[PDB]
């Protein structure tokens, strides 16, 4: 119930970025991992990774964090997906559709896209 285009762009973005966190990164602590929206921006240059975790507003936190952690291999990974030239920034957010809404602190940083040495 989105832009059309950032639900297109951001759902394809949920399906590298639902494999990058739940299949890459760590997860042996806490409860599976479900990417509920990864919704792009309305100026459809970033994917809002929305997810919903078992787990402590910590453990949430350290799923972010495993994310964090491994930024620029979540966002490799993200660059390995070969299906876009223009890069959209992913957003580390938890769901606040189903789930509680605890929002309070995000780091948007460590963009790994920046990686065009010269």
């Not at 495993?66 to 992913?90: H, N, T, V």
């Amino acid at each position: 119930g989105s832009s059309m285009r950032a639900e297109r762009v951001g759902e394809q973005m949920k399906k590298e970025l639902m494999d990058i966190i739940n299949n890459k990164v760590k997860d042996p602590r806490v409860g599976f991992i479900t990417i509920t929206d990864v919704v792009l921006t309305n100026d459809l240059s970033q994917a809002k990774v929305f997810l919903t975790v078992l787990g402590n507003d910590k453990e949430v936190e350290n799923t972010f964090k495993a994310l964090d952690k491994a930024k620029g291999f979540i966002k490799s990974e993200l660059g390995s997906r070969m299906r876009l030239r223009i890069m959209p920034e992913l957003m580390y957010e938890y769901d606040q559709s189903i789930e509680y809404g605890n929002k309070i602190e995000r780091m948007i940083q460590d963009l790994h896209k920046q990686d065009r040495v010269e």
